[model samples]
Target: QQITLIKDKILSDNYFTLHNITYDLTRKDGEVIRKREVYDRGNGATILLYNTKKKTVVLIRQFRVATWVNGNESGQLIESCAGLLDNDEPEVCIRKEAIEETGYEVGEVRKLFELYMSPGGVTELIHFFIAEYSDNDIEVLELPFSQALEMIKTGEIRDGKTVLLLNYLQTSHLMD
Candidate 1:
């Protein structure tokens, strides 16, 4: 199977590039030319920092307007430190973002995943990592691992990447 691009039109270029793409998708049955609107903010890196001895984790809180409009109530969301790669390697980007957003210098990070958060409409592949925070422009929250899971159950921790990382630690017994 081969994919052939028919056309790619820029829909918006304000903050990030958005495109209306038309392409031919060759399938087993036949070829279908389809059009899709894609949001390309570029790939990014995210990290969850935990302290095994302290049984604590580091996270951040920020206001996301999109969530507000979509009924997130206060629009303030708790999420792990993350940033767009912006031409940097995933490890480099996460390291920078960690200090920039949380005032933590992470060491010996373990890459947990490289995944598409939203494949249907967004072209964002997020590099997910986990590390022990040995050490913030932004206000950082350091809480117990159990509390983080409690937040998930209570809907306080709803960000996808954060939830996934927390669950991974919980199930994998990484904190132990």
Candidate 2:
């Protein structure tokens, strides 16, 4: 058995918290695997909101500092309305996030995939799901003042989990 120590925490965001941790991992041969303090974080959940009637997926375009740094438009992202599963059940948390962010009610949710945003440096276990939506329920909710304004200006919503979920549905033909 090896013990990992928390050296520092770099970024703590609204969704997932990040920390720098160091550990002496022991190999099968009793060799010590030493590495500098790397970033580790908590786990969360993400959901994909889909409307079968419209044949369209709901995505938001939001400005992200990291995305901007990577020169990835940082404006519009085709993602599902997802968030961190605080303390609530995975289904409950995801459903609430969908309703709050997109003003859409998730009719039927199906387990799609379990993913790690980045497992090597981050210990985030993201539970991905597919949320079925109806056209009548597609309404944009009143977001926070700041986020609302940003969404209006840039037409972006912050939910990468949603985007990936939609992609999964399209690629895998999970939706009918």
Candidate 3:
């Protein structure tokens, strides 16, 4: 039998900038001897924006660069209005993103879950929320040309988050 005193440790640290740069470790953690620094992209949230009056949900179609190059023609997906946390509170950030992305003011926001976007390799955790809205609360603005075209052609794009939320809503009879 062999006893290993050490498992693994962070020889350096994980740093990031949109372009190029590095910030000294603001936070650090050790998971079973695997050390890593936790960079604060602040907090982030996603909104499952719903319209109760129309019995239709609000979704956005966007072309993800990562998904596009991977040969997924269905990359244009219906997604919730989501964004980084910035410095504001999660609820506040979600509300702002909902309005900015879809021009909808939510009436009530209920927390659905908190999850790690990709815990295996990334330190991004997302707070998921469900917001109830009526048709009166939403205003249609010109979405991106590609998204608008997709919406018109497909009636609704395929998105993981949107599908999950809508499925949950449907099975729970929340829409009815």
Against the true structure, what is each candidate's TM-score? 0.94, 0.67, 0.63
Superposition TM-score, candidate 2 onto the true structure: 0.67
lDDT per prediction? 0.89, 0.60, 0.61
Query: What TM value does model 1 have?
Result: 0.94
Best by TM-score: 1
> lDDT tens string, model 1, 52-138?
898999999988999999989988899988888967678888888998888778778899879999999999999999989876135
What CA root-mean-square deviation does each model show from the true structure?
1.8, 7.5, 8.6
Model 2 stretches astray by more than 4 angstroms: 1-18, 73-75, 135-163, 171-176
Worst 10 residues of 3 by lDDT: 17-26
* Stretch of 10 with least lDDT, candidate 1: 131-140
Sort order, TM-score high to low = 1, 2, 3
C-alpha positional error of residue 105 in candidate 3 after TM-score superposition, expressed in Å: 1.1
> Candidate 3: where are CA atoms >4 Å away?
1-43, 135-159
lDDT of 1: 0.89
Q: Which scores greater on lDDT, model 2 or model 3?
A: 3
